Amino acid sequence: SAKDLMTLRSALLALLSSGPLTGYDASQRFGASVGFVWSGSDSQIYPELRKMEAEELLVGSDVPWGSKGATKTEYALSEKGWEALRKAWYEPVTYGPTRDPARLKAAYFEVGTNGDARRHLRAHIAHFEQQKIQSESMIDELKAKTHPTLARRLERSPKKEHERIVAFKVLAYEGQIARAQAEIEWAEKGLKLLDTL
């Protein structure tokens, strides 16, 4: 799916707007930040970074790596990269069709026992409770301004803009929390349904 690749491209542009990174660092920072809302692995990120440089959306250059005298290629947005980010953001969100394996499972719980359905709904609750705690913990790092990608972004932004920049990162994680809480409530409603069947 090419639409998903283009979205990964947009997430990399967003991350790299906080400052240039090597390939390895980009993938580590990605997974610890934007990766919580659009996940990308090493094997997805490395080839896209290379295409983006080939397309001249990114500029590559050699900087010191470690302290033994090794250098590594760090990627920075070009002016074309900056334009592409702006254009990507302006475009409307394309909503992909619903693919929810848990709702799929629930729709046909009759294939198994009511005890099996309870186990599925408890595993749903477990999953979204742990997501909620991660999201709440991420908000705390964002509001403290200690998250390392956020801190780098802020050091490159005028102080006048910090409230805005932080507010939007928080907003994203409030959305993960709101959804998590709806999923838990839904599963709990399902558990009560199962006692009446």
Residues engaged in binding ligand VNL (CB under 6 A) = 15, 18, 33-34, 36-37, 107, 138, 147, 149-150, 153, 169, 172
Considering the complex, what minimum distance in angstroms separates the CB of residue 147 from its own copies? Answer: 12
Residues numbered 105-144 forming contacts with its own copies, rule: CB under 8 A: 105-112, 116-117, 119-120, 123-124, 127
Least distance in angstroms from the C-beta of 104 to ligand VNL: 7
Q: Smallest distance, Å, CB 117 to ligand VNL? A: 15
Q: Does 185 bind its own copies (CB under 8 A)?
A: yes
Q: Within 10 A of 2 (CB to CB), how many other CB atoms are there? A: 6
- In the complex with its own copies, the residue whose CB is nearer, 71 or 146, is 146
Residue 185 touches which of its own copies, ligand VNL, none (CB < 5 to 8 A by kind)?
its own copies
182, two tokens = 């709806």
The item of its own copies, ligand VNL, none sharing an interface with residue 126, based on CB under 5 to 8 Å by kind, is: none
H/E element, 114: helix 114-143
Residue labelled with tokens 């295409």: 51
Q: How many CB atoms lie within 10 A of CB 71?
A: 12
Give the CA count within 13 Å in the CB-facing half-sphere of 63: 12
Minimum CB distance to its own copies, residue 67 (Å): 33
- Comparison of 39 and 113: residue with beta carbon closer to ligand VNL: 39
Identity of the amino acid at 113:
T
Query: Tell me, what amino acid is at 140?
Result: D
* Nearest to its own copies of 50, 162 (CB atom): 162
Element (H, E) at 186: helix 162-195
- SS3 label, residue 93: coil
Chosen from ligand VNL, its own copies, none, partner binding at 186 (C-beta under 5 to 8 Å by type): its own copies
Assign 1 to helix, strand or coil. Answer: coil
Angle at 19 between CA 15 and CA 23, to 5 degrees: 65
The item of ligand VNL, its own copies, none sharing an interface with residue 109, based on CB under 5 to 8 Å by kind, is its own copies
